[PDB]
Amino acid sequence: ALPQTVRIGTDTTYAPFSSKDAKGEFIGFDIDLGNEMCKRMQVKCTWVASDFDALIPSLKAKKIDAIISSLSITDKRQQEIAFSDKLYAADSRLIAAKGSPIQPTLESLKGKHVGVLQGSTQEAYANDNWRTKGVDVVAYANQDLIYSDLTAGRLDAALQDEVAASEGFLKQPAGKEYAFAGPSVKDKKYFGDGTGVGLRKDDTELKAAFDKALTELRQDGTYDKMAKKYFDFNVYGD
Ligand SMILES: NC(=[NH2+])NCCC[C@H](N)C(=O)O
The missing domain is CATH 3.40.190.10 (Periplasmic binding protein-like II)
Structure with a gap:
């Protein structure tokens, strides 16, 4: 069972992936992806702002459940945490x-x-x-x-x-x-090899659900529709 609310940490100083609008609300491609995946996962999601270097410690401390913050999938990070499938290239x-x-x-x-x-x-x-x-x-x-x-x-x-x-x-x-x-x-x-959702290693069910939602929104064209708001190129890569 996935948590009733998946808490997602992000550093909102990295437009066009994650930043704040004039109201202070979270905007960008990361936000759009996260929200769309949560929709498909049928869970509530709550965004949590923090400095970028605090995200992985917060994840490890269970203060958040996920990181979507252009988090590059690296060999070194995989010794500490898990990643969803690639969200986009970087x-x-x-x-x-x-x-x-x-x-x-x-x-x-x-x-x-x-x-x-x-x-x-x-x-x-x-x-x-x-x-x-x-x-x-x-x-x-x-x-x-x-x-x-x-x-x-x-x-x-x-x-x-x-x-x-x-x-x-x-x-x-x-x-x-x-x-x-x-x-x-x-x-x-x-x-590393593109960015992904950062997750605790033991949260296998949560990773699977993110991975499932991602594949589905890529498959039906929703990924590309969301990306066109920001980019005139293939942001995803290979
Ligand atoms: N929201 C942010 N500040 N993201 C920074 C990501 C930079 C780089 N891709 C990394 O994972 O370290």
Whole structure:
């Protein structure tokens, strides 16, 4: 038996996947997916906002039951928690000022100030490959502070999910004078294989129900109808 109310944690600072509208209500693709799956699962769902780096600890502590927050499915995370089937693809890419020669390389980022989300796969990658080697990698409680430090010049570059940067910043007025700096960063190990619903390992029935709802809403075309609100491309991937 699934719980009468499935509590879903999300970090609402990652448009267009999860953010807040003017009323403070949860909006974005993650929210739409979550709500549609819950509908099909015939359970009530209650969204819970928290910082991104608090989601997996909250899940483990049973303060929430699920995470839908562009949570990348990684080898390392799977040693701690479970995942539903893939919700959508997620690649990492740097952003910087328009015209920046910055590339996702150690040589290019020497003496540069680079922002990453605390508890993200991007922080993991940046800390290991760049911060130890002298690059000023700065971790942030949330992505909106990163964008703001970038636009104010405190940061030279930021590393986050490509689609989030693109739709949530670059294509917005705030990011008109900014661009991707270099191609997406390739690293299977660190960045994983798309995003999924984060779940406790022993909640097998809940995972199965999420997986069932997801397959069904993909199959009947509801996934693509919801995605078109945000994207003119195949957000799902392969
Ligand atoms: N709602 C968010 N802030 N999501 C951040 C996700 C970034 C990256 N995909 C990760 O799992 O670490």
